Design a protein around this ligand. Structure first.
Ligand SMILES: *[C@@H]1O[C@H](CO)[C@@H](O)[C@H](O)[C@H]1NC(C)=O
Lengths: 58, 278
């Protein structure tokens, strides 16, 4: 997702699988090198399993 | 014309055969020639014995009965048999519809003619799909014999239970089918000279399990001097299905199925010898 928000708080309500990933907070003021911090949001889940079967000298 | 040959066991009459080809010369066929005694009665599960002689002229104008078998989709293994066989069982079935335990017969194809002169080479074809079925009668050696100017022989040996049952001890040593093949080669060595064949140039060849047979024969001392060359098509003695490593196991399953599963292996075999081959 293309997600550039100008806010000291990141808020994602009712998160989804795809909304997961690596986010970085960039902070700059002109003096020196911008400050960056990284974080990995790891949304977790467990869908319903699928069960299939196959048949098969002599 | 009227192919008659006198062997060590008696006079035999053959049959002339023309080929559907203008360059190929005709051939002489000797069908249903006995190379061993019938493996019936006390001779079941026993090595082959030489054939009995005859005083008249014996006819060899038609194939003899084939060894007992059940290929009418009686749970045969397709992965081991040649595709031409499994894909045409209706025709194949016609070649093995006439069966008997007395099935130790071979067929001889003799060319009627080239270049170098002298006794002609003998090529003995050993058939085999899974050791349970088949017959040399399926392989017409007429063209190979006529074209190559060589003698071609097809052999019928004991199959499946009757040909390979073994109790893992002295009660039944097994390899009866191989012993028939050895015996057929013996007969050939001793009588093929009467047909113009060279016993010093005998080549054994076979495809599939037939190829397995060829290699197994080359590892047996019983083959010394019998033949000089071997051709193995799509078959070896090293494959997983070339040899039965647990004969006793299967021998008892059979016995249980027919009510012959007794403790004593000797009594078990005698019990089987009383049962109808079918
Ligand atoms: C930042 O976002 C939060 C919620 O996401 C909001 O309540 C707040 O007013 C915002 N403030 C600024 C300065 O962006």
């Amino acid at each position: 997702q293309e997600t550039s928000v100008l806010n000291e708080t990141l808020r994602i309500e009712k998160i989804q699988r795809l909304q997961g990933g690596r986010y970085y907070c960039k902070a700059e003021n002109g003096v020196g090198v911008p400050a960056i911090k990284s974080i990995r949001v790891d949304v977790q889940y467990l869908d319903e399993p699928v069960l299939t079967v196959h048949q098969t000298f002599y | 014309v009227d192919p008659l040959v006198a062997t060590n066991f008696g006079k035999i009459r053959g049959i002339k055969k023309e080929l559907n080809n203008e360059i190929l010369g005709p051939v002489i066929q000797f069908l249903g020639v006995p190379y061993a005694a019938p493996p019936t009665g006390e001779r079941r599960f026993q090595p082959p014995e030489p054939p009995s002689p005859w005083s008249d002229i014996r006819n060899a104008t038609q194939f003899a009965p084939v060894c007992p078998q059940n290929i009418i989709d009686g749970r045969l293994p397709e992965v081991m048999l040649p595709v031409w066989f499994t894909n045409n069982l209706d025709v194949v079935s016609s070649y093995v519809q006439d069966q008997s335990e007395d099935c130790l017969y071979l067929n001889i194809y003799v060319p009627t003619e080239r270049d170098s002169g002298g006794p002609k080479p003998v090529m003995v074809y050993i058939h085999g799909g899974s050791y349970m079925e088949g017959t040399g009668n399926l392989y017409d050696g007429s063209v190979l014999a006529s074209y190559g100017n060589v003698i071609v022989i097809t052999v019928n040996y004991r199959l499946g239970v009757l040909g390979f049952l073994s109790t893992g001890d002295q009660a039944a040593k097994g390899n009866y089918g191989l012993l028939d093949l050895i015996q057929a080669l013996r007969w050939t060595s001793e009588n093929i000279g009467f047909f113009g064949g060279d016993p010093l140039r005998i080549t054994v060849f076979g495809s599939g399990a037939g190829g397995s047979c060829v290699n197994l024969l080359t590892l047996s001392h019983y083959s010394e001097g019998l033949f000089q060359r071997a051709i193995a098509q799509s078959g070896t003695a090293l494959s997983s299905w070339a040899v039965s490593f647990q004969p006793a196991k299967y021998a008892r399953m059979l016995a249980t199925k027919v009510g012959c599963n007794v403790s004593d292996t000797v009594e078990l075999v005698e019990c089987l010898q009383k049962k109808p081959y079918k």
